[PDB]
Structure formats: structure tokens, C-alpha cells
Amino acid sequence: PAMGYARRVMDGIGEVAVTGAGGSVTGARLRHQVRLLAHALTEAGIPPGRGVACLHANTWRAIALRLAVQAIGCHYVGLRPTAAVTEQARAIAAADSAALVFEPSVEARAADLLERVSVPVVLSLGPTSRGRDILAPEGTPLRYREHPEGIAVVAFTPKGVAHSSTAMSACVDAAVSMYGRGPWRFLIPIPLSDLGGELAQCTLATGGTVVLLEEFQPDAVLEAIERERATHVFLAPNWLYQLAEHPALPRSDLSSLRRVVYGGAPAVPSRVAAARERMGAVLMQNYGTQEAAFIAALTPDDHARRELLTAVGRPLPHVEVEIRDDSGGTLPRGAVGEVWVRSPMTMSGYWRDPERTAQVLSGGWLRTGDVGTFDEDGHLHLTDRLQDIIIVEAYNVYSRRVEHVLTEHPDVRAAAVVGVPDPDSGEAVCAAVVVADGADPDPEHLRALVRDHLGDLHVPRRVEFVRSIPVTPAGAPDKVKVRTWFT
Ligand SMILES: Nc1ncnc2c1ncn2[C@@H]1O[C@H](COP(=O)(O)O)[C@@H](O)[C@H]1O
Ligand SMILES: CC(=O)c1nc(C(=O)O)cc2c1[nH]c1ccccc12
């Protein structure tokens, strides 16, 4: 039964559920808020099959809102803060949203959205101009309903990834396997609209406490870990580096930390290495996709082998991984090919688009869109996203391999390598490179470094020094923006 997930989370909630800016929130108080928000969403006439789009910041009420939406047998649709109004609006429509719930603090964006798409019901967590306040019940208990098709979440890329309640329950099990037994004091500075939100549920479910920050500032995270004696934190890779390289870090007390988790985007091995030294044996990397959820983790002990700094780790329990050719046949250990995944955590499919779902799923296996290989010890190494491979006359140049080499140089902090088409080379390799502090390395040294380590075909023809590598909304390297610089 689909309602089993929301109950699992609800059943877990301990003494203190959330801490943040304004102090603490007891389990009691959080439970209450779920019941309340649940009743209110039910009353507003939102039916089970349909989606509840949610626009909010990282607030404790937003944790309750998700859980309520899911308990009343609807699918949660977290509108990403960094997404454009046009992308967000497409999401509300395509997810079959019966409602837009929003926080007063983002009424501007709510208004903007409503001028672009129409939604039966419009509610808000507090008094607002453009919507009906929901925070306005007896000894009323939480009254669950079942989603017709068992969907807990729909989350967008522009496809809507539909995740089952079963899958989200499996993620709790995964979380425990990666992060330890509870309770956790888990610091979440990433948006609750996506993975942050699932981490919060995993945290509650295991009887721990969520610690919220609105955005990421290195000092803030450092104070928070010490003040709240946090055990866990999830950072984007860039944030890891900022935190590890911060001057206060050795002055600070982070003895509470059992896990500093990072992932979501490819990591810079040398910068990771540095973090593993500066922070303790607490570093853990996580690899997932929107479609696959969790796939693999690299443990703190894995981080103490330099060989493994180019890896994502061993697959998690119940996660089967296969490396495959263009044909579709299984390759041996050490071979490079497409990463395919079978697991309990994989998507059900792309919402109301089986055309696209079918080019991605095949026999229970999910094509992640990544390319990689396994080592002697069974750690997966990603050589590239499929889009990002550079082909030259029947040879694959994996852009991430070139970046690793470039970035090993002491004067290079970051690198994005792309192809542009060339009649005489097939594609010509190009590198945007971010230089250290106030260094001035020699393009030719970098070219040479690449040539010594990989070979002639890998050596970037052009090398542009840039102040930073542009990111996507999601915070991944925008290698399409970079491709354009060199055309
Ligand atoms: N730990 C990691 N190392 C390398 N790439 C990663 C990691 N975690 C996530 N990713 C990338 O994020 C991609 C998908 O992100 P998304 O488009 O948001 O699903 C994956 O296909 C990976 O290439
Ligand atoms: C494990 C991880 O870092 C991760 N990454 C992504 C990504 O999009 O890059 C997505 C997910 C990740 N973990 C998840 C768990 C449940 C659902 C989705 C995800």
C-alpha cells in the first residue's frame, strides 16, 4: 500500500524533529503540522491522483508540507528555487497539479507563475495576497489516502521523473546503509524541493533531527556543525572545497561529524584529496541521477586511497550495475561503456510520457546516461556523461579524464573540456581552465601534462583561462555554455 511510506516517516519522528534559525521544533509540533496541513489540503478539494506543486524556501513547515502532500495520497512537486519562471510553470502544468502551495516569502514568484498557468486551488503557508492561507482542527488524526498509481514525487529535468512510494522507502534503507544507524543530526543546506527534501524524510524516519540552513555560506555551516553538534551534512562538491579550504576550519570543532557527504556533480580529485586531509575520515561521496536515485557511495576509507579519487564508489546494496556497448551487451571488468542500473530506488517512469520512458528503461534496467568502468576492487569510475564524450575518428576522448589531468596541476583549480567539430581532427579538444588564487601557469605546461599522461589525442588545442566554470540551475558544469565559447 502506497501510504506505507508516509507512515514510515511519520512513525519515525523523534523528540526533536527540526532545528534552524529560530530554535527547535519538537516531533509533537511537526506531527501536528502534518495533520493540520493534511486536513486543510483535503478540505480544499485536492484529489489523490493529482500533484501538489510546492514553492518554498528551506523552512521547517516545508518539511511538513511534503509529508502531508504524500500522506493524502498526492504526488509532491518541488518547484526548484534556482529554476526560471518559465521552466517552473511548465512543471506545474505537466505534473497535473491540482494545487499550488507557496510560502509568503516567494509571493512574487507565485504571482509570476499564476499569470502563466492556471491551477484549480491556490494556498499559502501564512497570510498572503495571491492565495488562501492554510494555517487557519480538533483532536483530528492524520487521514491517509492512496495515490492511484503509487507515486510519491514528480521531479523535473524537460521530463518529470515519477518516483514510487516503494522507491522512496528503499531510499531510506539506502540512506541507513551509507550514513549509519540513527539518530542523525543532519545539516541540510541544499534545497528541500529536491534531494534535500528526501534527506530530511530519511532523517526523520530514522528518529533524528534535521538542521536547516536557507543557503550555503562556509562560516554558517562551520558554526552550525559546532553549535548543533551535527553528525551529517550534504554538500555540493564546490561547497565541500570552500569549506575544506576555509581558514577557520582547523580552529573549529567538528568532532560531532560522522559524515560529510558530497555529490551530484563530478568532483575534482586533487581538491577532494585536500578535503580528505583537512577534514577527517568523515568524507563520503554519493552518486545518483534523477531517474536512478542513489547508485553508489565512496566511503571515508575509500578516500584514503588516491587511486579511488576518480571513482564514485561501490554500488549500494540492491543496486545492480552493468557496463554495456552501443549494441546493448554486457562488457567485462575494466572495459568502458554505458552505465545501466537495476534497483528498488529507480523511477517508475517519466510522468505521462511512455515514449521517452521507453528509450531509457529496458527490462527493468535504467540507462543512467553516464559512461564508466569498474576497477579490480569493484569501484565504479565515471569517465563521462554521454553528451560530453569527444569523438575523434573512432576513438573516445573522455572529457572528465582530461579535466582530472589538467586539475592535478597545482596552479589549476577547475577545468571544463569540450569538443568542437573539425574536418581535420574530427573534433578539436578545448579547455576552459580556472587558475588558482593569483597564479599564472603556462598553457603549454598544461598541454604537456595532458600529453605525458593521456597521449596526443587528448591534448587541448585551445586553452582559455576563465574566472569560473558556469553552472546550471542544478549546479552542474554547464558544458553547453562552454561549448559555445569555442565555436
Ligand atoms: N558523485 C558524482 N560523481 C560524478 N558525477 C555525478 C555524481 N553525482 C551525480 N553526478 C552526475 O549527475 C548526473 C545526473 O544529474 P541530474 O541531471 O540532476 O540527474 C549523473 O548522470 C552524473 O553524471
Ligand atoms: C546520490 C546523489 O547525490 C543524487 N544525485 C542526483 C542528481 O540528480 O545528481 C539525484 C539524486 C541523488 N540521490 C537521490 C535520491 C533520491 C532521488 C534522487 C536522487
Numbering used by the authors: -1 to 134, 138 to 158, 165 to 494
Paper quotes:
A further enzyme, McbA, has recently been reported in the biosynthetic pathway towards the marinacarbolines in Marinactinospora thermotolerans by Ji and co‐workers. McbA catalyzes the ATP‐dependent coupling of the β‐carboline derivative 6 with 2‐phenylethylamine a to form 6 a via adenylate 7, but, unlike other ABSs, McbA also accepted other amines, including substituted 2‐phenylethylamines and tryptamines, thus indicating some promise for the application of this enzyme to reactions with a wider substrate spectrum. McbA adopts a structure within the ANL superfamily of adenylating enzymes defined by Gulick, and which includes firefly luciferase, acetyl‐CoA synthase, and standalone adenylation domains of NRPSs, including the dihydroxybenzoate adenylating enzyme enzyme DhbE20 from the bacillibactin biosynthetic pathway. Each ANL enzyme is characterized by a two‐domain structure in which a large N‐terminal domain is coupled to a smaller C‐terminal one, consisting of 4–500 and 100 amino acid residues, respectively.
To investigate the promiscuity in term of aryl acid recognition by McbA, the structure of the enzyme was determined using X‐ray crystallography. A K483A mutant co‐crystallised with AMP, magnesium ions, and the β‐carboline acid substrate 6 yielded crystals of diffraction quality. The structure was solved using molecular replacement, and refined to a resolution of 2.80 Å (data collection and refinement statistics can be found in Table S2 in the Supporting Information). The McbA structure features the two predicted domains: the large N‐terminal domain of residues 1–394 (McbAN) and the smaller C‐terminal one comprising residues 395–494 (McbAC), with the hinge residue at Q394. Crucially, the structures of many ANL enzymes have revealed substantial relative domain rotation during the reaction coordinate, with one conformation (“adenylation”) assumed for adenylate formation from the carboxylate substrate and ATP, and a second, (“thiolation”) in which the C‐terminal domain rotates to enable the ligation reaction between the phosphopantetheinate thiol and the adenylate intermediate. The substrate 6 is bound within a hydrophobic pocket stacked between the loop between G295 and F301 on one face and L202 on the other. Few specific interactions between active‐site residues and the substrate are made, except that the carbonyl oxygen and pyridine nitrogen of 6 interact with the backbone N‐H and C=O of G295 at distances of approximately 3.9 and 3.4 Å respectively. The relative lack of specific interactions may help to explain the relaxed specificity of McbA for the range of aryl acids used in this study. The exception was quinoline derivative 18, in which the N‐atom in the 1‐position has had an adverse effect on conversion, perhaps disrupting the hydrophobic interaction made by the native ligand with F301.
